Amino acid sequence: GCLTQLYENAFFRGGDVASMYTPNAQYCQMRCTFHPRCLLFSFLPASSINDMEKRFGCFLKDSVTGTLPKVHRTGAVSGHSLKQCGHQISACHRDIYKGVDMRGVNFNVSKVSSVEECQKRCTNNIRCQFFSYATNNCLLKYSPGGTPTAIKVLSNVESGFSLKPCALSEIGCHMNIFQHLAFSDVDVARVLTPDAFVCRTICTYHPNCLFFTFYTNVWKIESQRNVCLLKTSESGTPSSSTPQENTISGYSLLTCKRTLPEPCHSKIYPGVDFGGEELNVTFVKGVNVCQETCTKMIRCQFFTYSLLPEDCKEEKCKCFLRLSMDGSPTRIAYGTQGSSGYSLRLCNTGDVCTIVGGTNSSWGEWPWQVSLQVKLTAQRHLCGGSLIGHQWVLTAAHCFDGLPLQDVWRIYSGILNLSDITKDTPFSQIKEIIIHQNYKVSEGNHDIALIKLQAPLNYTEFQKPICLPSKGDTSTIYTNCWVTGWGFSKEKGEIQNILQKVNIPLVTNEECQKRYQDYKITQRMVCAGGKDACKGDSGGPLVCKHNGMWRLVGITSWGEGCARREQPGVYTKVAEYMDWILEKTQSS
Numbered sequence: 064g065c066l067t068q069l070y071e072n073a074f075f076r077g078g079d080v081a082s083m084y085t086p087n088a089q090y091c092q093m094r095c096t097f098h099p100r101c102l103l104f105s106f107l108p109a110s111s112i113n114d115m116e117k118r119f120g121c122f123l124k125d126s127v128t129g130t131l132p133k134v135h136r137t138g139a140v141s142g143h144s145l146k147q148c149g150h151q152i153s154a155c156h157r158d159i160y161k162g163v164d165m166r167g168v169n170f171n172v173s174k175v176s177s178v179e180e181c182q183k184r185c186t187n188n189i190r191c192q193f194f195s196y197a198t199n200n201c202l203l204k205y206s207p208g209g210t211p212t213a214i215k216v217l218s219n220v221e222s223g224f225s226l227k228p229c230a231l232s233e234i235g236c237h238m239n240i241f242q243h244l245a246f247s248d249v250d251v252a253r254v255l256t257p258d259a260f261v262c263r264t265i266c267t268y269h270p271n272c273l274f275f276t277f278y279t280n281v282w283k284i285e286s287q288r289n290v291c292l293l294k295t296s297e298s299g300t301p302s303s304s305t306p307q308e309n310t311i312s313g314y315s316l317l318t319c320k321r322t323l324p325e326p327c328h329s330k331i332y333p334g335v336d337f338g339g340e341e342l343n344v345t346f347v348k349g350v351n352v353c354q355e356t357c358t359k360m361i362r363c364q365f366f367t368y369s370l371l372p373e374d375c376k377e378e379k380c381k382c383f384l385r386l387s388m389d390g391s392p393t394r395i396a397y398g399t400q401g402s403s404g405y406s407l408r409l410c411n412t413g414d415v416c417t418i419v420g421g422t423n424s425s426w427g428e429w430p431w432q433v434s435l436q437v438k439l440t441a442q443r444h445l446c447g448g449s450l451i452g453h454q455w456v457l458t459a460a461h462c463f464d465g466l467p468l469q470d471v472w473r474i475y476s477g478i479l480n481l482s483d484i485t486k487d488t489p490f491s492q493i494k495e496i497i498i499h500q501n502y503k504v505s506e507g508n509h510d511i512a513l514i515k516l517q518a519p520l521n522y523t524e525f526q527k528p529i530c531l532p533s534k535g536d537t538s539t540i541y542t543n544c545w546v547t548g549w550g551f552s553k554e555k556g557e558i559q560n561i562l563q564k565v566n567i568p569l570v571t572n573e574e575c576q577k578r579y580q581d582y583k584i585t586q587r588m589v590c591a592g593g594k595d596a597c598k599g600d601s602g603g604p605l606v607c608k609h610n611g612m613w614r615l616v617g618i619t620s621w622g623e624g625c626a627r628r629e630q631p632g633v634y635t636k637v638a639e640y641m642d643w644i645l646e647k648t649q650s651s
């Protein structure tokens with residue numbers, strides 16, 4: 064099961080399967096998440112340890128129990144992989160580190176006006192993995208495994224990673240595969256795959272893979288059948304291509320914006336066995352059950368469901384759960400009674416999960432944010448909203464006051480600049496509106512409504528759901544809460560074109576009551592406050608970053624003016640409507 068909690072001042076003892084340098088702990092957790100064996104990680108900031116070569120140190124760990132001895136160590140951050148965490152799994156990491164120099168193979172040097180300009184050049188260079196900017200020349204870099212070979216504290220250097228895996232690369236996306244055609248170049252790794260697309264997906268998430276050649280099982284040389292060769296080159300593109308019977312080549316799809324493959328392989332393969340280390344064997348009823356059994360057991364990486372009469376009892380046959388060192392079968396045999404497949408633990412396309420005084424946001428920064436517009440005499444943006452599921456958006460009830468809740472509404476998602484919206488821009492239409500039963504147009508109670516879209520949305524890195532809060536467990540005092548929208552930047556201002564963001568401290572429910580003596584601030588409301596949500600931000604998100612994670616805490620509802628001194632914003636408190644949410648939303 065998904066496990067997002069972190070452990071402060073804590074180091075896990077032993078169990079190392081890999082280690083590298085990473086700029087912070089969440090980056091290390093992402094490495095853990097994508098490593099085939101990592102369940103647990105411990106990270107050491109520059110302050111925590113005094114062994115120079117351990118600083119910025121990221122240690123990836125496995126354990127047959129799923130647990131390891133935990134030792135106290137001031138400043139060390141331990142935690143879990145995000146395997147099994149669905150759409151919270153993400154290869155994208157846009158943080159820029161001030162005062163930090165991440166080192167590697169410097170292969171390209173330029174002069175640019177800002178760190179941002181440097182990040183962009185890295186992002187658009189097929190070979191760039193991370194970069195460093197000084198203060199103004201710009202260094203693009205790669206390294207073994209994509210992590211820096213060293214990380215040093217230098218006050219006037221900023222560093223960050225290519226935003227390629229955030230879908231921001233202008234580099235092309237190449238969906239073409241080439242039949243009977245082999246690449247040469249630099250082989251960076253070699254694994255067995257059942258077909259070419261699995262191999263292409265492994266290439267896409269492999270740090271140093273830019274293209275691949277796969278060898279089918281009809282391949283002349285028997286010992287090389289099903290070999291998937293991950294490759295790269297200095298230029299980043301193949302320098303030759305050789306015609307070759309029974310040979311399939313293609314490219315990493317990491318630059319692809321809307322065809323980025325999921326980092327799991329969900330096809331079932333009849334007549335094939337996947338060899339590996341045996342982890343557990345049990346009698347389940349059919350291949351699908353066997354695959355779920357593998358997905359729920361986190362150390363399982365792939366399986367074979369046997370169909371030999373000797374391996375079946377009554378409707379139930381042996382389900383061989385297996386793993387290997389690198390996540391791929393150690394053998395693939397093609398004449399067997401039964402079917403093989405992979406664990407879905409890393410699938411991230413989901414099933415729902417558990418502005419005055421701000422600055423420009425960046426594309427995909429807030430991927431759950433939507434704009435709710437109305438086609439009346441003109442089309443206009445009225446409210447924000449939060450994507451919480453393929454078909455579901457959460458917003459404010461008052462957005463529909465006296466409004467013809469029919470074929471008038473158009474929901475926009477995955478969008479940063481409203482001015483970019485033309486009548487050809489794709490949009491979601493409303494299939495159904497769920498205003499809270501106890502809502503009333505002239506009162507602020509239960510300011511919340513669901514919207515079922517007429518079609519489900521595909522999750523991308525610029526369009527995906529925010530997670531909701533766990534139970535009524537808001538005893539936790541959130542410290543890093545933010546609010547976004549295209550609303551008025553001042554009282555009596557205008558709608559903004561570029562989605563805005565602001566960091567607002569939360570307030571107490573009694574202190575908030577003290578400042579609105581004319582209304583009743585209730586338990587089901589949460590308050591927060593020269594910086595505020597304003598007109599047109601209605602219904603948008605109030606998000607809090609907990610354990611490096613983002614939670615949806617409030618729905619922008621109301622305030623007296625905008626950004627008025629000691630009159631804070633009132634948000635519908637999401638914790639207190641989970642019952643109704645999950646209710647209306649897990650049905651129909």
Ligand SMILES: Cc1cc(N)nc(C)c1CNC(=O)c1cnn(Cc2ccc(Cn3cccn3)cc2)c1
Nearest residue numbers: 461507582583596597598601620621622623624625
């Ligand atoms: C105007 C505004 C300024 C601001 N700082 N921020 C926002 C987002 C807005 C936009 N808001 C609305 O346009 C609006 C209209 N109607 N509603 C529902 C509602 C809720 C609460 C009350 C008063 N109340 C508080 C507790 C009990 N009652 C009255 C109306 C919202």
